[PDB]
């Protein structure tokens, strides 16, 4: 199956993607308290909604919070400015909180289920968030010998991430508080805060700005 794009919401941003973010591919942002990563978590959960000429994939969304910072309300204030129904939008985004790491590696499991059922439905799963992909595993995996069993744990958990996105056509995206370990998103992106309240993403192998809006990011 080809390659789909959603839209970040902001065109510097989508061309430092390539055109957006993709899917068959896990997308990890990175970066301080702060950077913006659960803002641009919450724009995708609208943009990817948008039909594709706008940007979107006409897909839905299931989303993963391992902090409670899913805003409901952020979901509608986006999609109403973006000139789209905020109830709509938000029937539309599946949730589930995960309590701890076992959790959210089963919660992924799980989430196969509601990606088949929807598959053939004219609003199949586009976008999969996990927010955060690292917190529980960084609280519960601590110490001497933490770090190859995290590790290794974290790695069984993308690679079901990246079956999800590969069998079924879907971008995974992830946040990761940050500030020498191995990584195994597809792409990582680093993101930053600037000046005049601007943030700033680079690519982790040019630089796009954005800023924080009502319409989520934008340039
Ligand atoms: C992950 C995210 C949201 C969800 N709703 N139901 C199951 C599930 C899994």
């Given at each position: 199956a080809t390659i789909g794009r959603i839209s970040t919401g902001s065109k510097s941003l989508d061309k430092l993607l390539g055109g957006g973010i993709e899917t068959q591919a896990i997308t990890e942002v990175f970066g301080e308290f702060g950077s913006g990563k659960t803002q641009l978590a919450h724009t995708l959960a609208v943009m990817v909604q948008l039909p594709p000429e706008e940007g979107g994939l006409n897909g839905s969304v299931m989303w993963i919070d391992t902090?409670?910072?899913?805003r409901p309300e952020r979901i509608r204030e986006i999609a109403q400015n973006r000139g789209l129904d905020p109830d709509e939008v938000l029937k539309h985004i599946a949730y589930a909180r995960a309590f701890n790491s076992n959790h959210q590696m089963l919660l992924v499991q799980q989430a196969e289920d509601m990606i088949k059922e929807l598959?053939?439905?004219?609003?199949?799963?586009?976008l999969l968030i996990v927010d955060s992909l690292t917190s529980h595993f960084r609280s519960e995996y601590i110490?001497?010998?933490?770090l190859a069993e995290r590790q290794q744990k974290l790695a069984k958990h993308l690679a079901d991430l990246h079956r999800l996105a590969n069998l079924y056509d879907i971008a995974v995206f992830v946040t990761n508080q940050v500030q020498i370990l191995a990584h195994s998103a597809t792409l990582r992106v680093y993101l930053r805060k600037g000046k005049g309240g601007k943030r700033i993403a680079r690519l982790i192998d040019g630089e796009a700005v954005f800023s924080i809006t009502e319409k989520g990011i934008e340039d």
């Open positions: 902090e409670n910072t899913f598959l053939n439905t004219d609003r199949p799963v586009k110490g001497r010998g933490a």
